[model samples]
Target: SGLFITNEGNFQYSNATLSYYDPATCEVENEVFYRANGFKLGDVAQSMVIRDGIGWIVVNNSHVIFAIDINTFKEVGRITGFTSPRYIHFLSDEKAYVTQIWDYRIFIINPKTYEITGYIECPDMDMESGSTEQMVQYGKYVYVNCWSYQNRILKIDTETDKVVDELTIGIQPTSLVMDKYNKMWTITDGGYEGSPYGYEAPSLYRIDAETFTVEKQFKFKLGDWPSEVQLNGTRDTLYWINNDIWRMPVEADRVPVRPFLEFRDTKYYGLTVNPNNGEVYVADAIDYQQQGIVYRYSPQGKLIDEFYVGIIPGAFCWKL
Candidate 1:
């Protein structure tokens, strides 16, 4: 229990509180944490992970799911059915994998019997999503990205937890990374031409986790609205974020290769990495309604620390 992180709203709503940051002293101090009056967090705040010490907070728009106590940060519990949740992983110790927005369900959460032990739908898929978002676990099944607006690539079967097959991508893949050679990397937003919802130009798809087949497709030039996608765990290299943060080499198959734009923020949202302590956690939502921050890095993008969050975080994780 030397280090751990997870804070997503309760920054005072229904008395919300879950603050604990000290990565070489970046300081985020809050004490009496844990309140769940039906978990009402609506402006993004969704990734946090820890297993044995028990800390998990993926409260995107607060559809609810909090279970704390990673060494006395106390409050010990919370969980609710999801609706707009974003990313979560850990498919064992009682299963967990949630990511949902607008439709096509993927929430298979179950924290010691909390609920939602099923759902991997995605039938007609369309509600303007288009970003596969991100989901993990590969070997038996469970890979998500029906990230909408007309995108699809779903599969589930963690040994019979079903939703057997689905594929069709490009146009707006929206962040994904599941490498180890079994491949799956998709990042798209390529339709954000000047933000009136027109240009969809972000694409990077290379999937083939045993023939769900996409094979290759690389395109990125929509500038400043790119969104997040990560791959660090020796997948060779890859990390992306729009308002200033980029690195690629990912073995060159989807060539936008070796582009570099390291750390710059005027407000960003979501990025997470832990590759055994190379540490990188980003989510700078320049006052997302009034205040939000979580920028820390070192995987060659060093800015090593910054805290003060609680408004629109959406993704982050750390431990060991």
Candidate 2:
């Protein structure tokens, strides 16, 4: 089973919904239990974290978190009091952290209780939004990217619930992932505020988990910002959608020789690869007002199947 986080943007606040996909049956189930009993989730489903049999959906614009039972598709917990929440990462079964925009602190959550436990204070290094976006756990610390403002990544000791260290990274460090060798990988979307003027391409960094320092950095051409940097299940390959689906080995000797796959006449809004199998799923967001389509391809770039999901199918999470 797979959960595709669908968004209608803040413009159409009520259209954000969750759609479930089954590979074995090839069925995309949309809104199975949404508002089943006069319970509203939220708008703009930014990201999700599935842990301890619960789906923690961070509804960004609505400023609330909806917890659902994955097995039964029923609401378990509905949390409130958040401002521009972005993503969630679980440090352990009992504890997790959530990033918030328009604020200076990261909120802590007790996953078992589905409640805000505490928060980790963040330094005001920059003035853009004082926001935190994507995060990944490495060893005993959580590395979070300040996407809108800072050129630094905050390292928080999860056990201590405090910011222990920071690293000077790319222009606007955003997306993050981990590889087979346990190294933390992050790619920037460059400067969002000064895109056309001061944006000087983007850089990808490979950071050492032990020392929390950048070991290597790869540079991309100007206006060639990449999105969705991810590692396959085997942890041997790294992929991101640029002009085409570009990929290379985790320990590559040179730049990606060529795109692993490409689509002609189709516009891809999001991408995800199956860890269980090596299949790739790309979401074609059609006009952002109507239903979007998701295409599945084989590991070798062979076409398999395509299905229509909700409006603006972007973030995808699989239950394995």
Q: Candidates' TM-scores?
A: 0.30, 0.91
Q: Model 2, range 219-276, lDDT digits (tens) per residue?
A: 8878765667777889778877665777788897577766877745445667778998
Model 2: which residue pairs collide?
A: none
lDDT of 1 by residue, 238-287 (tens): 67776666756666754543344444546666676667665677767675
Best by TM-score: 2
Residue 282 miss distance in model 1 (angstroms): 3.1
- Model 1 reaches what TM-score against the true structure? 0.30
Give the distance in Å from residue 232's predicted Cα in candidate 1 to where it truly belongs.
23
Q: Where does candidate 2 stray beyond 4 Å?
A: 8-12, 33-40, 125-128, 192-198, 263-267
Off by over 4 Å in 1: 1-27, 30-64, 67-114, 117-143, 146-152, 155-165, 168-185, 188-203, 206-216, 219-227, 230-244, 247-305, 308-320
Deviation in Å, model 2, residue 84 alpha carbon: 1.3
